[PDB]
Each structure stands twice: as structure tokens, then as C-alpha cells.
Symmetry: C3
Subunit: 103 residues, 3 copies
């Protein structure tokens, strides 16, 4: 069946996207952990170096800065990256549609 072959093509596209989303999530977890470690060490350095004491903080808060973005310090204990977890709401709706179709 040509019908069967087209369903298989759709299934491959769906599976390749799901695997790529998982792979990107895994990669970003490694990047996030690494960048957070650099933030922690940079803060630890700053706290142990008296020659840096006169340097002011920019006091630019996270969200305003993300929308608007030396000098002054930009990195603070508010700079840590949170985990990235991609929504599967669309894929879940597709899965619900398939279960229904399957008669």
C-alpha cells in the first residue's frame, strides 16, 4: 500500500524530530552545567582577589537584561542557568489523535 508507505514516512519524520529534541536536551544539560561551573569559579575568584574590591556591580537584573542587552560586573549568583526541558504538547496531541484514529 502507498497508504502504508506514506504513514511510514510520517512516522520516520516524527521519530527523527523526537530523537533530535532528546539529543538537544542532553547537549544543553552539559553546556548548562559547564557554564554554571564557570560562573561559580568566577564568583569564587572575585571573592578572593582584593585588587577587584573597588569594581562596582552593574545591578542589571536578569529578565530586563535578557530583553535589553568593562565597566561593572554582569555575572552574579542570579546568573546561573536553569535546566532546559522542551514541551511535547503538540506531539502529545498528535499521539492522542493517532490512538483515536486506530479505531
Amino acid at each position: 500500500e502507498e497508504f502504508s508507505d506514506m504513514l511510514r514516512l510520517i512516522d520516520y519524520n516524527k521519530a527523527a524530530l523526537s530523537k533530535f529534541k532528546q539529543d538537544v536536551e542532553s547537549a544543553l544539560h552539559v553546556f548548562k552545567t559547564t557554564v554554571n561551573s564557570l560562573i561559580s569559579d568566577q564568583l569564587l575568584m572575585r571573592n578572593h582577589l582584593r585588587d577587584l574590591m573597588g569594581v562596582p556591580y552593574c545591578n542589571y537584573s536578569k529578565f530586563w537584561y535578557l530583553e535589553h542587552a568593562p565597566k561593572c560586573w554582569l555575572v552574579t549568583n542570579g546568573s546561573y542557568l536553569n535546566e532546559t526541558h522542551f514541551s511535547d504538547q503538540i506531539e502529545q496531541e498528535a499521539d492522542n489523535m493517532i490512538t483515536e484514529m486506530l479505531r
Copy 2:
């Protein structure tokens, strides 16, 4: 219609990819802003620490280094990350094909 159901499956795959591209773009903007802040603070530190004055710069330019990649300094004011914006050229061509099909 089986026809209608298959169009719906294609539509879900298309929408899930578009949402994931937007989500990745949002995530990379946060990562980029954070890494740029670490570059700025690292440069600010270097400029205020006399014990680092004898350390040379590698003088490896961005593009050659990206293709070829302590020691000497690697990070400079040329290291800042630019914004990432993913092409939708293929999706735009698909949208043009759909508008036409729709008779």
C-alpha cells in the same frame, strides 16, 4: 477521510518542528547572553589584575580558530557571541506550496 487524517499528521509534524525551533532560539539567546556576560567580566578582571600583565595574547582570530581549534589569552573583545536566528526558507516554500494547493 484517511486523506484528512494524513494531512493532520503532517500538520502536527510541521507545527512540532516550528515550536521546537522557536524554543531552541529562546534557549540559545539565554545561553548567549550568559556566556557574553562571563566574557565581559573575565576581560574586566584581566584589566584590574597587575599579576596578569606579562601574560601574552594568543592573537588567534575568530574564524581561523573556529575552523582549527595555558599558554596565552584566547578570549578577547572579539569573542562575543552574536544572536542565533534559524532560517525558515524551507518552511516558507512549503507555506507557499500549501496556499497554492488550496486551490
Copy 3:
């Protein structure tokens, strides 16, 4: 043919995903190179600043930390990011199925 039009829609979804995977791989290579340069410079700084000599290393190894994640140093010469290359196993299986279908 409606058949021909649906194959074209599947082809656009497949191509848009392949292009996006390539684009993400290109972007992550730039981010990875940049973060590795920040690690190298942070290590170089630490090695030239006597005021940091009493600061201990956390001695948290990469894999346990990635699963479990100042203080002590988190960044070491074991923190460098490796290259990210996304599997195309599913897409390769789809390509093999298409070659076969094509009679």
C-alpha cells in the same frame, strides 16, 4: 495528484528538520569553542594569581557531577566540551526505505 502533493509536504518536513539539525550543530560548535576558550583563560588566570593558592579543588568528576549537580574550584582541564554531532540513524533508515519504495 493529491498523492504527489502529500509526498511533497512530507519532503518539506524532512528537509526542514535536516537543515535545522545542521544549523544547531553549527551554532553549538561556536558556543563550545567559546566556552572552551573561557575555561582555558580561567585556568590560565588561576595559575598566575598567588592569592588563589589556598583555594581547594572540589574534585567532583565530570560524569557524577553531570548526574548530581563558593567553595572550591569546579572547572578543571577535565571540563572542556567535546564536539556535538547528532545521529542521523532514523533519517538513514527512512532514506533506505525511500530507495526501496522507488521500485
